[PDB]
Amino acid sequence: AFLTWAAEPEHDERKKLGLKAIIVISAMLGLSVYIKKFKWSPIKNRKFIYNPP
Amino acid sequence: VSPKTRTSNLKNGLTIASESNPLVQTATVGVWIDAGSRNENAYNNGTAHFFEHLAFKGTDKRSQHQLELDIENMGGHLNAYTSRESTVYYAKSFKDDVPKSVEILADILQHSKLAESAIDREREVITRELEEVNKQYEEVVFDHLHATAFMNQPLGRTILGPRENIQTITNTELRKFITENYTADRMVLVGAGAVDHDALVELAEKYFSHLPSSQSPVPLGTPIPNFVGSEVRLRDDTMPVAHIAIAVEGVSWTSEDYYTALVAQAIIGNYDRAVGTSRHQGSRLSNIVSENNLANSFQSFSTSYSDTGLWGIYLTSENTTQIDDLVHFTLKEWNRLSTSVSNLQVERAKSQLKAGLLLSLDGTTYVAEDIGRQLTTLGRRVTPAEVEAKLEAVTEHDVRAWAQKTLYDKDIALVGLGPIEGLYDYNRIRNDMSMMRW
User: Which among B412, B426, B429 is the top mutation candidate for probing chain A, defined by the most A β-carbons within 10 Å of its own β-carbon?
Assistant: First the structure.
């Protein structure tokens, strides 16, 4: 254990910062899906009537 | 100071309203009805317009030919139009031909034949009208505009109705429509020009006294519309001119913001490259558009109905690579009604409107149309003194407050016809309804 700490002494801080990053990034991913769908809905929902000239 | 509008009622509830002008020798009498296409359902949509054709096709007394001759002999003419909320039937004549004209109008409204043979004949004429409106681009644009703004609602239907209904309209449903809708409490007999009010009331008692009254008489101009932000694109690369309308939900006739909406509309104003003075107009949009050749014309509008309205602008342009600029600059001028307008623009627009609302009424038909419209939408003719007071009450704060709740960051209905490849998608147009700097 001690030697593992000696090789990577940032270990504890790194994993806590990673937890914060995971949470924020996941929420941003969820919101980015909502926003993309919101903005794209006029394109996805478009309908056509064709009357050949 | 114009002469006072006199108003009387009959017993059935028919209103008579008149404004005499002893300087003219002609008169416009007619019947304004608080009824139109909006009163149809989906199955009989087109009936009101169908009736307007049959009204001139012969009555129980005069045949089609006799009707023609009787009017020819009068010397003036008869005219009619059906809209979404209003039907009008009027007769322009000589001063002393007014009793003839009232009698003919009373006949065609109350005592029309609606003969199966004539229904069948008009059924083709009206079918041909479906393929020839196609040319009147402004009407094409505004009919699509109503269809999309009031998607699947009665205001969204056209006046002509679908082809399917035209083929299935019977004399029964025609008769039913005019029996339910053309009632005395919904009708106004209007005379303007060389008419005596007391003479017109006597003629009303003679011809329109046996009109049905409705079971539940509501006041004149009594109506829920749910506006849909949406777009119709009718791209046609072979057309040289693009026609674009953009509108938001506007104000009804009786809104408290009715005058505020008119002032805001006057701040943007109209423009037409073919008119000499248009390059010098005060409107900011006019200056941008004229300096940059962005459009052949634009026309701001504020259409009202009993319970809603559409406020917006109609643009025509040959500049097909700068449609984006035209739309961008137009909507940025709308943004400024929310963010920037001050007493400078507001007082200028009020000045221009105080005259404009009076100027419009320059002939007997315009006066009659004004009395008829006001009586069927508000229940009274509003005096110019009252109109001057309501306009004066509009402040810059009122305009900004109205624009912030009606225009700012709101959904639009958008119709484009012609070479509109350069018109961007809905989001980019709707994003111009706000300013990120504000």
Answer: B426
